[PDB]
Subunit: 476 residues, 4 copies
């Protein structure tokens, strides 16, 4: 009921024979699903060399031929969404419907990059002399190394693959060892779409060892990392020390500003359903809720009522809308957030404890009035917990929204043009969502500021980290 786990190097799958493996466990049952083969150091060298060899011709392939191939892969992902999503549910925990939506979203991302790869436009700059021609070209940088995490194992990786391939680069990818089936399926569908050997390689191992070896590989010219801020800082320093380009999607700590003039009940119902998708294990998860005092009670009552409709359970079961957390350590982490909040006077309005059974189930948790020195209001919980505090002055709430070094997503609800304008300009965040959640579209750029990373994924900006600028000036 769970697919075989493989490596994929230079157009060929590889199994465990002669390799170390690591068990893969279902977070909803704690049972072993399969064993994941680790790349050797030689495997990783072979993958870099194959990616370098593939890049020599792939960079020159027609952008339409490359588009055709990427679209064929996206079509296969859509055909296989139920099977791929089911394995994601098994090795990551999220409800099946969420896993399938992730596959579809990843297919749209891949298709957008196919379209955008035809549009890596250069610029002609009017010259000071009529015998001179000035062009600014954009060209693929070369072999890329990417590392992607477990919270959206299929779509996070698709970002790395879609951006590298559609820009004309090639890629060695180390996806999440703990939720690996999504990555194997990506290799499978790119293989089935006819992607030339070496263009896409997937490897596994001890993450620090794999990432160190990939970053120090001389043929690797650009790194892309999605993960935690402290690991991001370590890999970025190493990459920078070798003058290697990097783009980073790190954690966030999203503030929510609910103005007194908002549709308060509407905001509460939307934010409850959105918060507990993927059990809050979302880089953009709304976490710090600042609700104008006159609306606080109305919002909190509406929020708790909507949270009360959530059904926690095993992700393949009918009607389950929230699964377990990804591992036992996440349960302990939320426990510590809850304990820290209560010690400092906060009220646990609902949830706050683990749920019974084997497997890492935790109740959706709502914390009222957590102070500014609680962990909840400072450290990214990445889990099914929110803090809701009143505010009086909008500028004070904005200053609090900007106090943390995080700056990924942010949210606001208001009917006022002036409020919307002031909030959106004053927020220090890569993304500002007003009255809805609009970060899904592949055609918009997704990225952060401050500790939340560098660069963007999706949109027109998608290839910026993958292309070099070349100024060519010619006198005739």
């Amino acid at each position: 009921d769970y697919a075989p786990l493989r490596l994929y190097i230079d157009g060929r799958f590889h199994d465990a024979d002669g390799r170390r493996t690591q068990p893969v466990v279902d977070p909803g049952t704690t049972r072993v699903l399969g064993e994941l083969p680790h790349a050797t150091a030689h495997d990783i060298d072979a993958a870099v060399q194959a990616a370098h060899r593939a890049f020599v011709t792939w960079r020159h392939e027609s952008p339409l031929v490359r588009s055709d191939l990427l679209r064929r892969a996206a079509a296969l992902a859509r055909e296989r969404a139920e099977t791929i999503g089911r394995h994601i549910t098994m090795d990551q925990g999220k409800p099946l419907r969420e896993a399938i939506a992730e596959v579809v979203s990843a297919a749209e991302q891949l298709e957008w990059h196919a379209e955008e790869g035809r549009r890596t436009y250069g610029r002609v700059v009017p010259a000071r002399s009529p015998d001179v021609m000035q062009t600014v070209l954009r060209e693929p940088i070369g072999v890329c190394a990417a590392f992607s995490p477990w919270n959206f194992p299929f779509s996070q990786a698709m970002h790395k693959i879609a951006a590298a391939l559609a820009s004309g680069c090639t890629l060695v990818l180390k996806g999440p060892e703990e939720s690996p089936s999504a990555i194997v399926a990506l290799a499978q569908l790119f293989h089935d779409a006819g992607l030339p050997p070496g263009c896409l390689n997937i490897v596994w191992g001890v993450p620090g060892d794999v990432s160190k070896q990939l970053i120090e590989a001389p043929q690797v010219r650009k790194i892309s990392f999605t993960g935690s801020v402290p690991v991001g800082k370590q890999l970025a320093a190493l990459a920078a020390s070798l003058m290697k380009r990097m783009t980073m999607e790190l954690g966030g700590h999203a503030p929510v500003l609910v103005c007194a003039d908002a549709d308060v009940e509407r905001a509460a119902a939307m934010l409850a359903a959105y918060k507990f998708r993927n059990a809050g294990q979302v880089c953009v998860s709304p976490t710090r809720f600042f609700v104008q005092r006159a609306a606080f009670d109305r919002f909190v009552c509406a929020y708790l009522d909507a949270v009360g409709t959530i059904r926690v359970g095993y992700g393949l079961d009918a009607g389950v809308t929230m699964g377990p957390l990804a591992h036992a350590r996440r349960v302990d982490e939320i426990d510590a957030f809850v304990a820290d909040a209560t010690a400092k006077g906060a009220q646990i309005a609902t949830g706050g404890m683990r749920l019974p059974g084997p497997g890492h189930y935790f109740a959706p948790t709502v914390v009222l009035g957590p102070t500014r020195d609680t962990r909840l209001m400072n450290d990214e919980p990445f889990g099914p917990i929110v803090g809701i505090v009143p505010f009086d002055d909008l500028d004070d709430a904005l200053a609090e929204a900007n106090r943390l070094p995080f700056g990924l997503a942010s949210y606001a609800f208001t009917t006022s043009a002036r409020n919307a304008h002031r909030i959106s300009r004053a927020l220090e965040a890569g993304m500002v969502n007003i009255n809805h959640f609009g970060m899904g579209p592949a055609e918009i750029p997704f990225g952060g500021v401050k500790d939340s990373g560098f660069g963007s994924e999706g949109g027109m900006e998608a290839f910026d980290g993958y292309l070099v600028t070349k100024f060519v000036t010619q006198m005739n």
Copy 2:
């Protein structure tokens, strides 16, 4: 007397040393001391960062046309003061007066381009999937910047940092070159005289490693811009990245030149000789490795040596001098070592190759024939008045040799063939490819490198990329 007072500039006020440590500034052509440069204290640098942050709060919101007017005023003053600023540059850096003045004028054009470009930091409206949704991609100034710029073009390298920071709506703490500082003082003076609000531009001095460490580690500093050597760039980039701070870098190059058999060979040789020995070859884009198609090799060399022979080495303020001394004694030692290494490995020194007489750091224009692939000259950036010229047979082999080094800033090619021009420009791994001329001057084009040569661009439309953050705003109405 003939050299201006050297000062710090913090939060709109100039500071003399008043008890601070100083460092002598030496004229490289006479070795005489010109003046004393005051070092910023740790407290001075903190005050500059805090001043830049207070200034950023309002300057970020100032009208782009008001900011443009002010930056243009500063550029007009630079043009008015070009001779005086240029003379002092010759004195504390070495280059001939005509080059120093041309550097100032070029920096004024760069400043004006940025004034114009600051009005054009356009956002994007992305058509939404629903008619009640508005999707905008905004570009906003990142915040306080720290910049470090070197001595080879002390005025225009620094102007790049100032123009890009200020015109994007950021503010700046700048550490220019202690060994050639008058240009930086003049920059502070003219932005001050143009009425730039206090805190927007601050200039500091000190022990370079200590100052840069403090600036990068200052929490309010959000972005770094460095022009200098590759190893220092790698050290500072690693420090900045560990703090998740954005960086752009203009590092060294090792520019190859491909002279095809079908080129105007004599025209190429004369142009490349005059261009190479500008600033005594102390130029990040300086043509260094000459690959000349075998059949054109002898014709090119004779024409190159004839042109090299017309260069007049002397003191930069003296009439008719077209090459000055090197910037410091250590540069003479460095070129000596390149020459010795080439000779030991069998290369021919066609002209030059020795230091020139006199007090000051004078060195003869040096042309090395047939240096092998393991000579320092063909691997390490000499950044001085020396070239190597080797024959090639197959153009693709020459291109691989051009791309072999981790450097990738400038590159040059001379050909009349449309096919050669296309194949060369596509195959070169370089941020800039110059074909049949030297065209990296215009403020409206992007200047930058690949691989070890750095990342990001200065000038052109790309000038603000490191200074703006992307903000996606999506609103349901």
Copy 3:
């Protein structure tokens, strides 16, 4: 005469007077005194202007964009230095208050400086090719000799648009400005002359407007037309230009709707809309004309609007304290009278104004008409004068439908605090420009233009050169 500058033609770098030419009197609309005689170009003069523009274009198209910019910025600086003198003559031959004429010059200097900057940025595109030996470039190149026609309401800044756009794109220009308010155009020729613009790049001609425009449009060297004026004249000239496959851009009239939502700062909107409306006595292509005020705010808006209108001082444009001058000519006074009578005949109330003022000058009182019906001229035809109509509305979508009912579509205005109202109104309006809570069409860096009968193309902004550049696709296999 003594306080008014000499009127001249300007052809191939030389000024020409009336020797051998027919002339036309130039009249001060505030006094009816004759200011001077305007020389008419002969047919041969116009031929010479077109030939000179063509010879100039041959080299001007290849001049460095930075050299062209330097020159254009010098001309702009001269405009700033001469603003008081140029403005005084504009007031004399056009009628508007001195402060308005000087502000017009300063605005035109900014527009010209913007085009100097934008001329360096007529970027082409490199399109990634299907084969690595192919190079695909999309170039933008100047189209050639342009002919332009600009009106009297902003004689200096409307003409500046034609000159700045043509010159900064690499084109050259034969311009026919307004014979009724001509000194601004002569001053434009003088400052481009003084800045060193090469001969032939800019030529100014005068004459019988229909005859001059016919000859210019039919000149084979002329490749592109640009016209600002009335819709019916634009349609005649556009049809002639199109019959010869010549490119055109057009800035025609508008009939601007204003939507005042109930949640607006009503008093602020009324005060702003009153001062803005009667600038240049409403002789403004974007002039707010049809005011749709949500019923609950109607009385409050009207009371504040009438109060603000009451502070306007009508008089001669050079006199201290005058904030509205006379209309441009006697036929304008007759036209506004006919609007007033037509509204009165159909049941509307004249809340203030509604009559002509004494004196030989073409003075008319600022006029506010309440409740004019859908079949009044005021709610259908562009009045281009000191008159507005104000009606209540209940449902915003009905107001939007009325705002869109006319074939005009230049400017439009709205006042609201609601994000939804602002979004719904801005998307639903059929207009080239939507101003919400303020009047923001001034900046040189934004595109100014209309839809439907109000024309096509834009002036200013990134779009300024679109009508002046041709696309050239170059594809090369190596």
Copy 4:
């Protein structure tokens, strides 16, 4: 299968047979046999199509660009699936060899898919404001109902240009394709219908072309016209459109010059130019027509060109091995005869061809004319047929001046190994498209259009939507 498909109108999502309407026979140009009867739209049919397109636009303009793209890509996939049948019918009613007809369908599918992608990217601009409380956006919005007219030379892909650009921009369309080769348009209606395109978005009509085009252009709801056809008809339609202030784009005739430099790969150029020239029997808007070959390469080029022309096989377009079919109609045979007669009467040499070929159909021999003078029709009028003129040149600047002498300016071609030649030629040519050493105007991602009499606006590329979008400047103070 030798069947020919039913010819129908398509209005508001439903097909119509003739049902007593006037009809017109459709004739196979290779056999002269009647293939079927084409129904003409009545005036009421045309009114209904305009009204249906207007209703449809109300919701189509607000549809998600991704939903619209999905639908257009489904239509493209159906075109690819049906390519053999659609292509066979094109050969039957237009004449071109089957392999050309199929390639036209595939090329049109690529054009449709590109527009699907580009419709997601009709980006607006945010202009940095002078005050922090102001928001300035430049939006691009679909103009409304479009009317389009497309010709017979590429009946499927010319019409696809009109359909793809209108629909993908958010507009709707009433299309009048070529009555003489109508099956391709019916096939287009069928596949957009089969893809689920909402009713009214695409309507196809037929009739007397001047009457249909007059009625569509004068329909009030029609806001924009797009025409591909001849220069004189384009000028007639453009003047009518301009008189009503309606936006227009035009792809008219060309007269392509070819500059063959002495340093070219001459034999490669001759062989490529021969095969490209006689595609669609030269009935191509970009067809290479005037060949200027540097004197030193002239003999080599002509000899190699004649050899390649000699390999062309003329016959019925469905027959095996045929590489050129008949001309589209008898009137084309008369026209080419007149070009040949004028050339010989003025002293040129007919090196090959020059006569009609046997049989009932409009077959004509590939014709190469040597040394036609500047006063021959061949060097001045677009022949649009299987004929070229070849003259030597000595000075490259004189060849460029001759290449630019005509008011035509669509495509142009050059062959050289010199970077200087390529640069000087590509900059000096007055043409919308310059092809150097190959023919590179096929890609959907590049802009296709002309200058001077050859039209204005572009199809394909990023520019594809420029005629279909209005600019809206929104400035909001908060």
